[model samples]
Target chain A: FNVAHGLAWSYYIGYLRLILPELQARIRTYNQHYNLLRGAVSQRLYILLPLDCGVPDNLSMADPNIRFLDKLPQQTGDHAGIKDRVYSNSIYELLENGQRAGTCVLEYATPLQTLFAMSQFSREDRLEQAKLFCRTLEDILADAPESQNNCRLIAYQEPADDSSLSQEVLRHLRQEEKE
Target chain B: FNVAHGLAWSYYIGYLRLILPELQARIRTYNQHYNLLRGAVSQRLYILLPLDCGVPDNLSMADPNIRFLDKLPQQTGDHAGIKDRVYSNSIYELLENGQRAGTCVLEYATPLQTLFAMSQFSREDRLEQAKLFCRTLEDILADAPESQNNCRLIAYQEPADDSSLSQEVLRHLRQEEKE
Candidate 1:
């Protein structure tokens, strides 16, 4: 309802009109710069079943998605709630149950193939970037409440593997409460 | 066998690395810019067949395609030869048949929908750009030898229509010569 939301939407529209082209160009530059390795980089999806989660007091208008979804009935309550955050271009979806129980779903690009693509980079810089990604995820998990005995920490790359991991996580959720 | 050919190959390799991405981005920009008009512009293929055709005395190296194809055996002799010229991003393929006959193949963006796209521009500038495209094509065709009874000036927009135009051009060529 504020001028901030109107301005934010306008800025986003203008950004797509102009800045998106340049961003896409930069991506191509990265793609060609790393073409010597001749392979795609590996990306990973990590789901964090945090022990505690709660929505922030003030909703940010910067992310239109957050603003739109913030009003949903499920998003309320002091018991664990979803708090979506962006860290280093990665997405973190924080899930919560009761006041002390929650989960964080972190999706990030891994360094599995990046090491090959970045062979030309200084060994120090390459390792630093790689370590930054891994360390960030670890920090996020550490901030969450301790994992329970039945809590699952699943990791997989392929779609089929993700399906198996997803079922395991859902099974744990089903055991905790009725649908 | 020398470094020139080796270097030429290297230049192309590097050019593709950089240029391909920009070309793709330009396509997206064009897509969005024209989406405001709601429909795709009508692109036309024009074929100009002239009676008198001959190779140019001094071939320029500005176009690598011309330089490479100029060395071909078919490009020689008293009959017509292909003289591909580009002006203002439009192609002017001047086909010469010895000293007496010539045909110019001109590929250009038509102004049929350009007016709609250029509506945002100053009326003076918009008209000038439109006039320039048409004037350039006219000047190119005017320079060619006049078409005879068998010579055809066919143009079309659709792919199927282009096939008919192509076949007619090929049919004229077959009637004019023998293996």
Candidate 2:
């Protein structure tokens, strides 16, 4: 599991390096426009992350964050071993401080449904959801330095809606300059 | 047509912005491992840049670089004025100094096929293709300073694999430091 996790992360890192230049150029052009950029970019990350479960709408099945389990045992009577054994649609739980922090899930629909539903969100709703997502990620990172660093690599320090990762990159770029 | 073109570009710019931060983190992790990272990143770009036409496999029917043509009139007996005109499978034709530079075509298959085919190229073939793509882009920017700036916004000054933009960004950061 460790080897697989490390390999997955390394691949993600390499993939990011490949797109960074084009990504930065686009971000510069759309500096203050969040909603306009949200859908396409969000889908891009979701696609790039390589989820394990397949989307019925022909999306990539491999998720960078969650690896799907091949077999989920059924609950039955006298299955005493199943007690206190958590079951998840997502098998790959993110860990923090050696404990499971959260399980990833895909809130997905058909291509048509996605288009309709995405626009239904008010800016206020979007903002609130964004905050919730950010807090969830922060909670996952709260207890582990290593996980936080990995989050910095595989995820963003901030949530998806704000400056995304570019602001932090800008910060680091400036810090490097100070040295 | 112009309005649609403008709107499309803006959306693309916005979309790219959202992915920047996550991309940066990933790149940092994947550095010095180009081959390993190439496949996933390549597919991500392909998906983000929608192509106009569909293929047998599940690639998006939207080419990011090639805007789809609404109407392609066929040549006929009375179309004498349209002699010497060229047609393309690709709707988008990049112009350089008012001359055609090249048309963008995605020789696509399944994502797995894409990875395999991309790797099948000899190093020399890859380098040659990179130069060709770069020069084609340069030609598209040759006569228009305005277009060149937009190129900076919408296109890479160099081919993706070479770390060209990152190096340029590094140079700019250093210059800022000196100031």
Candidate 3:
């Protein structure tokens, strides 16, 4: 399972690397072609993050802080277009040392690869694996961080109407001074 | 090509047998958690059919005919909520008849996979492939042949929406319905 999971994620990552350029170009084309139709920049983009909750009709996400981009289309045929809608909810630290933290359940949450990684650990070791995972994410948050740095105390919430992941992505992009 | 494609598809069909049920349950859980926040039965029930193009944002689609549930949220976090909007310009078509037709092309349009599939055949061969592909689809459409029998005829002006192999899966699902 671990080997397969790693292979699958690596394949997906590699797939993204090759596809990203084409994906970007395609997005630009869609934006150019459909922007006129929608009267705004065409919203479409995705990332490495496997949806916490799998993609669905409404695509309700597990994390609440994540959000989508602004002026999003009513429907997106592709995933990148699907991701623009993700965003984070709060900007305060609620985790270790209170920098930024969000609620997540492993059995019901976490990426499939991360879960697979934990599966290889012994029952006692699984807790340690989780700690290690937390540390890794913490480092990421501390280093790159949300560029906007709007607030350190972040809390996630499921969407009352839609999903949250897209909102977070939009927030991140806006932080970078792009879309 | 036919022999290889047949095997590849057959493998996936077998895989789906094991994977789909888990996928369905997990998705259902997300939907359930999602509705608890609102405590509305309307929100809890999922519309299994994939969200099709052409419906306004404020709508939810159901069965033989697209049924409207209610207006979706207009703004959820960074993403736009369900608003009253629809994409009307794209052309659409249903599964084709049994007669082996020649290769067809939705030229000067987006959809790389479709373009590639169409590209694989000469005009004559394309028509033959189209008929074979359509024959498969016709079986699926058998289950829910709509008054409109709506299937997208995906041709855009320039730069078509070249998406993933999932369209193959969609085609498969539609065909399986008939089989």
Candidate 4:
């Protein structure tokens, strides 16, 4: 729960290109570098994968049907375990048990750090930025249906229904991990 | 002609993340690694856009839609597209059709020269890298729809609908289409 989102755009563009090579240059980054400013405020977010958020009873990580998050970052440190290592490890465990889908809780320390950083000078459709974030999750799910199998990996994000106010909030804040 | 997609994540992350995507980082350079190894050979590249990003119903060199784009190392030339001046004088030329996309074209004198220039790296994914290169078009289209209305921007591809495409793609390529 550190400043993960604060420096999100840096790795995001490159990682997206690496994962969904089809989207090569389509995903653009702008205005994501102002957290370093003097007065820029930071946020603390919490990610909670529901208590029941592991693989479904009918599924196991070992089951081919079970899928997991893809492309865990290579960096390791104090906060590393909670962010990349945690998400990917959890998904890996679920897949090992032949699980498919479930609920989970996760959190971040800084929420709008990067957004605010870019917002200071950014002048485009910020909505698309949020949508693009959503689309990344969708893209990962679409490209790699299998994980830890092919070199490609899979990341999943369940799009909330249009009627979901909570989902809308998450989308606006660009956070959507229900637990 | 070559494959690989990359984009200008700078604009998006620097100024448009809040309104467009939920990115927290951005790419600082197009080909930072390759750009450094320029003592031997030179290369020119063109990045194309897709549909959904419409083209100008009536475009001109005088339009504000035109942007003076710059590549790394800086080119000193009368116009863009010269294999030698790949660093400077490049411009973002919008297409004039339903599919209003733009491109960044890189030129080289010989295949071996170009190969040696690119061979310094052990990376691949030309098509995806090209997609990454098209990020500018997507960001522009996402924010400025009227400029690219009726267009659905796709990955950089061969020109089909826009006469302006060749002008953007080929150094000596002229607009020969009847559009």
Q: How would you order the candidates by lDDT, starting with the best?
A: 3, 4, 2, 1
lDDT of 2 by residue, A8-90 (tens): 22222222222322433333333334322211111111111111111132222222323332211211111111112111111
Candidate 1 lDDT (Cα, whole model)? 0.25
Once fitted onto the true fold, the runs of candidate 1 whose alpha carbons sit more than 4 angstroms away are: A1-113, A116-135, A141-168, A171-179, B1-179
Tell me the tens digit of each residue's lDDT in model 2 across B78-100.
11111111211112222334443
DockQ-based CAPRI category assigned to the predicted complex of candidate 4: incorrect
Which sequence of candidate numbers ranks them by TM-score, best first? 3, 4, 2, 1
* DockQ by candidate, in order: 0.01, 0.01, 0.03, 0.01
Backbone clashes in candidate 4 total 109
Model 4, B39-146: lDDT tens per residue? 211122222232222212112223333333332333221111011111121223334443323433221111111112233333243333334435444565467533
Best by DockQ: 3
Top candidate, metric lDDT: 3
Per-residue C-alpha lDDT of model 4 across residues A1-179, encoded as one tens digit per residue: 11221122223322222333322111111113221221111121112211111212121222343232322222221110011111111111121133322211112111122333434434343333433433443354345432121222122324432212123223323332221
Error of 3 at A54 (Å): 3.4
> lDDT tens string, model 3, A26-118?
444535554323223222232223322221212234344432222222223322111122222111111223222222111111232333333
Chain A TM-score of model 1 comes to 0.21
lDDT of each model, Cα atoms only? 0.25, 0.26, 0.27, 0.26
